[PDB]
Amino acid sequence: GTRRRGRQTYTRYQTLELEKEFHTNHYLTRRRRIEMAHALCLTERQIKIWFQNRRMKLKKEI
């Protein structure tokens, strides 16, 4: 039905579960990414995007 959805946003529930994750680990593995697809209930590539935009927005660690 709806496979080609056009949305470039994220919900608090996602931004949160994604924030804490990036805080604990810097790099996400293949299996680790899938583990998030369940809790977050999103595509496997969706997570990569949040990491590509986030990791790019920030730099180094204070």
Give me the count of residues in the chain: 62
| 33, amino acid identity | R
* Number of CB atoms found within 10 A of residue 54's CB: 13
Rounded Cα gap, residues 43 and 57, in angstroms = 22
| 49, amino acid identity | I
Domain tally, the chain: 1
| Location of structure tokens 């990036």 | 22
Question: Does residue 29 come out as left (phi exceeding 0), alpha (psi in the -120 to 50 range) or beta?
Answer: beta
SS3 43: coil
Range of the domain at 9: 1-62
Angle at which helix 12-24 crosses helix 44-57, to 10 degrees, equals: 70
Rounded Cα gap, residues 12 and 32, in angstroms = 20
